[PDB]
Amino acid sequence: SSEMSTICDKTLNPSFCLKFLNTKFASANLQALAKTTLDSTQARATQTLKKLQSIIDGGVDPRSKLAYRSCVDEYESAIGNLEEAFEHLASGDGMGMNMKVSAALDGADTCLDDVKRLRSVDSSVVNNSKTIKNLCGIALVISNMLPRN
């Protein structure tokens, strides 16, 4: 039994992880699976940055505006962190990947905390933030399992 076939038990939302690995017929090669996971995570982050900007540009109230602007800053940083995560993955450096994915996760988590006190919130921002947190959680488990140099 490959690690991939049971890896979801080590995540906060195993349902999400099971959906993700089945939907994408996940590689049993952990290096390959790290890369496809990062791909999905970066695509989601980039989409979310665009959504946040669209919401801000449409004109929200000051409380929402500060929250979504904080989310933009967190996502700009998270996107950079995921870019670095890719760079380290390309060298086979699982630990490097892990540190940078961890930093990205905090960006998504911080966005979720920045929007929590809002009376009414954009569901795609909340849902994408949760999705990115979950995807980072999967990538952390994978990067942990890659061979040490």
In 27-61, which residue ranges form alpha helices assigned H by DSSP?
A: 30-58
Q: Which amino acid is at 108?
A: A
Which pair of structure tokens corresponds to residue 111?
């966005």
Q: Which two tokens stand for residue 84?
A: 């670095």
Documented resolution in Å: 1.5
Closest CA to 4 of 13, 15, 12, 20: 20
> Can you list the domains of the chain with their CATH numbers?
1-149 (1.20.140.40)
The two tokens of residue 142 are 């994978």
User: Are the beta carbons of 130 and 115 closer than 8 angstroms?
Assistant: no
CB atoms under 10 Å from CB of 23, counted, come to: 9
> Would you say the C-alpha torsion 19, 20, 26, 30 has a positive or negative sign?
negative
The SS3 call for residue 14 is helix
Q: Report residue 34 CA to chain centroid gap.
A: 12
6's enclosing H/E stretch is none
Residue 128 and residue 47 in contact, taking contact as beta carbons nearer than 8 Å: yes
Contact assessment for residue 18 and residue 26, using Cβ atoms and an 8 Å cutoff = no
Q: How was this structure determined?
A: X-ray
Whether residue 77 contacts residue 49, with contact meaning beta carbons closer than 8 Å, is answered with no
Q: How many CA atoms lie within 13 A of 120 on its CB side?
A: 4
Query: Is residue 21 within 8 Å of 4, Cβ to Cβ?
Result: yes
Q: Residue 145 — φ and ψ, nearest 5°?
A: -85, -5
Contact between residue 59 and residue 146 where contact means Cβ atoms under 8 Å apart = no
